Design an enzyme around this catalytic site. Sequence first.
Site, short mmCIF file in Angstrom:
data_model
loop_
_atom_site.label_atom_id
_atom_site.label_comp_id
_atom_site.label_asym_id
_atom_site.label_seq_id
_atom_site.Cartn_x
_atom_site.Cartn_y
_atom_site.Cartn_z
N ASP A 69 1.09 -1.25 -0.11
CA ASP A 69 0.14 -0.13 0.15
C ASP A 69 0.81 1.01 -0.05
O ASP A 69 1.80 1.55 0.88
CB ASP A 69 -0.86 -0.01 1.19
CG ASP A 69 -2.16 -1.13 1.35
OD1 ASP A 69 -1.87 -2.16 1.18
OD2 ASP A 69 -3.49 -0.56 1.33
N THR A 91 -3.20 5.05 -4.55
CA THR A 91 -1.97 5.62 -4.32
C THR A 91 -0.52 5.08 -4.91
O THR A 91 0.29 5.59 -4.89
CB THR A 91 -1.81 6.05 -2.80
OG1 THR A 91 -2.09 4.70 -2.21
CG2 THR A 91 -2.94 6.84 -2.49
N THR A 92 -0.81 3.77 -5.03
CA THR A 92 0.33 3.24 -5.86
C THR A 92 0.23 3.49 -7.39
O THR A 92 1.46 3.54 -7.98
CB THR A 92 0.21 1.40 -5.84
OG1 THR A 92 -1.16 0.86 -6.03
CG2 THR A 92 0.70 1.00 -4.48
N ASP A 113 -8.36 0.40 3.32
CA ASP A 113 -8.33 0.84 1.95
C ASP A 113 -9.25 0.14 0.86
O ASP A 113 -9.67 0.69 0.05
CB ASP A 113 -7.06 0.79 1.24
CG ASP A 113 -6.01 1.69 2.06
OD1 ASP A 113 -5.72 1.28 3.05
OD2 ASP A 113 -5.52 2.79 1.39
#
Lengths: 513, 509, 513
Positions: free
Chosen positions: C49, C82-83, C383
């Site tokens: 993450d 977010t990766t 997430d």
Amino acid sequence: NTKRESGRKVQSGNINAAKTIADIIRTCLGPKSMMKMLLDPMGGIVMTNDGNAILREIQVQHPAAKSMIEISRTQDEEVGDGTTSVIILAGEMLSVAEHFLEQQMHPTVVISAYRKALDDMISTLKKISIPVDISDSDMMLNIINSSITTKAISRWSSLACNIALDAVKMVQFEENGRKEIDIKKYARVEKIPGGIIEDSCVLRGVMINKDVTHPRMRRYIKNPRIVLLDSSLEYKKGESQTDIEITREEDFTRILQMEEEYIQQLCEDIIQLKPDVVITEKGISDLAQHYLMRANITAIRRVRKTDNNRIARACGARIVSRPEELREDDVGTGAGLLEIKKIGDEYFTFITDCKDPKACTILLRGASKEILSEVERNLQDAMQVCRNVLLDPQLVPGGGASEMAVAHALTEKSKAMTGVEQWPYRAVAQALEVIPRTLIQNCGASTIRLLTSLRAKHTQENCETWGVNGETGTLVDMKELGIWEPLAVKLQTYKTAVETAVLLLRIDDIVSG
Amino acid sequence: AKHFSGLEEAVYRNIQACKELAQTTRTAYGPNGMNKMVINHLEKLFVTNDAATILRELEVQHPAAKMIVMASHMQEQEVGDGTNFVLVFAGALLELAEELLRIGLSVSEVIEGYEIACRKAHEILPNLVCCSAKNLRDIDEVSSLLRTSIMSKQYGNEVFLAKLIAQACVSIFPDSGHFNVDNIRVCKILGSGISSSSVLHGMVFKKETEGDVTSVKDAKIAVYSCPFDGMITETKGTVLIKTAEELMNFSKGEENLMDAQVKAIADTGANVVVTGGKVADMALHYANKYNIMLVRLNSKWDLRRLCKTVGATALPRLTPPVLEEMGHCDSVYLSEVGDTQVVVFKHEKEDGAISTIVLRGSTDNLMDDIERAVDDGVNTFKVLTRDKRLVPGGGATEIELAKQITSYGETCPGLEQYAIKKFAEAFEAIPRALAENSGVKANEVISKLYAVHQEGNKNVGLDIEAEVPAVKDMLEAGILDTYLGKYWAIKLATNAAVTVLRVDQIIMA
Amino acid sequence: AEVARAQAALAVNISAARGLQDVLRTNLGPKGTMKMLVSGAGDIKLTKDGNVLLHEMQIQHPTASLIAKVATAQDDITGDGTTSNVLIIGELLKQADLYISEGLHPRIITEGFEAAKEKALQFLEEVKVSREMDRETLIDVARTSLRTKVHAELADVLTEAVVDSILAIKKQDEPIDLFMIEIMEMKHKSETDTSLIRGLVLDHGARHPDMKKRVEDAYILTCNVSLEYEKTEVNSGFFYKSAEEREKLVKAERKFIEDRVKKIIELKRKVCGDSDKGFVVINQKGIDPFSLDALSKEGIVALRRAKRRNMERLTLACGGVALNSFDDLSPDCLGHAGLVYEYTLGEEKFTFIEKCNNPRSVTLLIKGPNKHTLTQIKDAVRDGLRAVKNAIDDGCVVPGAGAVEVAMAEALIKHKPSVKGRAQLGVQAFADALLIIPKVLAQNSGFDLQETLVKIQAEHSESGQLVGVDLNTGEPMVAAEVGVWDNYCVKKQLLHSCTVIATNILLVDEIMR
């Protein structure tokens, strides 16, 4: 201690320091822009379109660097814009002029060339300034909008306009015949938490936010009378130390009530006489306030004397000692509306005022509490164009067209006049031209080729009515485009820059004691 | 940590750990255990022959190893012979998995293949259910099953230790369906032989016993770390020994004070005072007259063992016990334990969960080696209680999983085809660990097990028949495993292995 | 002090930025890998993450701050992606480098990114299609959203569980979860597992022989502090510092205890009858043995150890309101939960409240004896809840797994602009930036990164198909037919956040020390 280094040696150190600052801000100005990134000593990122910010947070140097910080601060206080502009002018002139004219050998001639370029620049730039009315809003609309989107804001452009335009005009000075420049303190902006644009009011007067803060202090009176200390309040507010002992027990009780007792004597006076507004420049409290609210009288608190006297002209009543002293009116009318809107438990008193010196603090509202900050910056730029127009209805249709206009103007004159002056005067002509060239760098292609078409265009068509825009990097009729640079910013920026570049040329000693 | 770059943690850190693990279970696993020397912060000689203990004592500096440490510790609770397995299966799979990487196999493509293989391995394990035995009323059946566990954890008297652990664990609950982890507690008392160790049941206080008896059936206890020097909180806790004049009245006075204390416990219910606090010269006299037992000098370990079983709760204050601070035991009596006089309580029908095996040895060095055998053997009894499936002796399990996994490479292909094969070799790491112990060629050990083709019987144990080669039946020898032991080990081993294999550089300034 | 100017200085920024993205390139999809992070605090965090990895510790640069700032913006709104964000910014820069290095301006590349980006938001509006908010459709999105965060096996366990959490709204559609977050963590036999418990679960519970295990009509009164002290809402002091002090503290706890229990038994009788309905009391602190005996016998279920975090959620779920004292409270203002039952697993007690009046709280129960497992499974849940949450709010969802990336790239067709070619540089760089998402799946999987990508372009040519690289084999496919679709929110907020960041990097041409 004393350090000795003489002549041209000292004068290069000045170039070295100035130009490094000037370069990125030379890109940051215009309608295209760059970022000057600070790498901090504590780490993390801060990046601005303004060079002084970054110098302040770290890096100060002896010659130019300190001079650029100091002139730019005076500039913010004045017009409120062009803080960016000064630093570039000062560094490009010192850069380009100094080296060729020192090898030739003539420093003091160069100082006299700066004057001759100051004299030329005022005359030629004023001829191209085009009169517009300040009784026609739609004309003032075009000029004010440009100032906003020079920061690259177009969202909050429209809102800034409607507030600023009417508001600055009503600001006078205490000569009363002017109008003109309404330099800050006689115009201001203060923000109120959260809000949205439907909670925005146009305010051509002043707002006091430590007036009616409660729903038991004055509602709406179209014209208030503010009562100065005197004979309906008092000057006193403190503790007595007639005789004191730490040994005494009753001493600890006596001393603390003596503060509170005093406040009750002040607040009892207002009750017995009936004001509708009282002013204290000492600054009362919440707790002092309370006693005023049962009589239903508002307090204005944490103010200053210059604000209350201007505000008295605005409100519609002069300064009276008590509500039983009534004599000849210095202002008999001055406020057109009284409006009160509540956000939280704090009430904010808006008072519309026309044609009085006041302080003119206008309301604003952002989309959030964070956005109040960004909105307040756009108004600082907007109220500037109102003082510019109000001073001189003549203003340039520039857009970087203006720097260019002067640069070519000087080249023409150097050739005609001939004389010993022509070489230093030709040197400064070129320094001015470096700047609009950088605007074309962001746009593309060979900058200098594009700049040549400007040169031919200046003698043939127009100097700067038909000028160049830095977003196209080509010639555009600048008047049709509706990009106009404020004359007041350009006049002052160019005056200070010559002087700061002229100061450094004069210096040929740096001691450290 | 410190900064890393180029994805070093995968190539570099994974193989450093592998080795660090190696040879502290690549010779102390299987039918003869082997001593390793660990020196602790309070320096002393400590011999380990157990996987979980040596890691608790080590400070792991590698972050790659630390995962593997945690899974061994689960396996210490659950089996006590699947704990030895976590290391050897896991280290071997990474060494082989590194080879695959070079060829161009992606880190996750191989992880797919290890996971379908593990599920498959588990399908073979009901073919490695060879015979079923389970009598938890018989000491005789139990001892043979524990026998391969304790073997790995000792080099000593294998046969005699097996009878002591069996005698404790059966006798405490022969009708339970689940057993506990702290069902047997060690008591480590100095003197005598190793084969002079014995079995008692219930709490033993290994520290000094005094007072004088007064009961053998009323075994109520009240537990304190609070001294009887002159600490009482019902009155003032101050002493007077800083003045010579007072100190004399105080010595005489300590007699009467002590009588007030002893009664104060007893009347509300005690017969034996459990005292982690200290019992003065005068104090010791008043309890002897009054005839209430003292178990003096109890360290924190001694008092905690006691609290957990009975639910008696200790304070550093002395006041009469409420009921939550009162415990009871089925009996107490004073008789020698290994030929040293101590207090022995009985629990086997009060709540059980505390039996005592006295671990003897004229030095503490001889004791640690047998501490490992019993403590691991507690949890091996807990597998045999839950199920009866009997899995052949060590290293004879391992071959057949390897043979049927090789089939699994041929029938499945893909890019997982390669990963499955090294999964096969990786189970062979365990008898290669025995070949490395025996100091003969790895290859020859492996050759015999495939040639006879027997699957669930034949392995090379540790013998003098393992020096000039031979193969032997570890199905029938008193060397047996259990199903769940291997089912847990593999599952957590593959948990540990795959997840260190994922790791990539630590990103920091 | 030192100052780097021009294209040299811009290199220093972009080379760093590219290098961070290179490290994180390893992550994305489930054919990616966990990265081990150790800050300066010990403990092994094994996280793939990207948001967790940027905050806890990361390589120092100025651009380290920027990749985290946009990670911060993305996570807060959407809470996925977010990766994903990291890799496109990078690949954009690469392309931009080739042109500047040829002898071009950073700024012209930047302007072309803005034109390029605007066409792509508009591209999303077409390519998106409405799909159900029914449970099984959301499984297919949940399966995909979990897979970009964390590994395959970890993704599979959580699919069904996460869907049932977000489905139990009241038709309250938000992008994020606010009160359906409850973290309960357990060291247990199952190495990795997540259990669905609907409604709010309490940290621990007390149990007595006489207590009612199953309660079918639970009138909750929520209390805080305590049965140890009367008239409290925060704890009272202690006395034990001397020998004498101990005795006193225990003795006056009898008075304190005696006043409290009375309130509760009299309230029970109004509401329940004698024992004919059940009564629940929430102790957030110690429960004294004397009070455990009386409450338990009576028909009152005492619960020991609850949080301030339980206290907020409990109030919404039952319809009751918090009290901080153990006192009488009107029947009206007590909450109703229609089932309370205690499952005692491991060494902890989880007491559930089921039949929630208003479900906006759900509980996921994290198993994992090991520290290394707990950190993997638990950080995937957060997430994950917010990912699926975006899908239920969103009416339209976009096809996933690089389906849209390759389509947008081909449509945006080279030699479509002709304006100056300033737009041409940007629109060309932005095409190749998008195609990073194919490339990194292909890298992770067998075959060469571009080798799989040209087959995606080819299949894309055949219309009626959106083609990308699978997450679970790294091969070409029709994404739509497999079901691998990603929410709209990821894909919309990606474009805005990627363009701004990388725009600013090229604007920086002065980095000051």
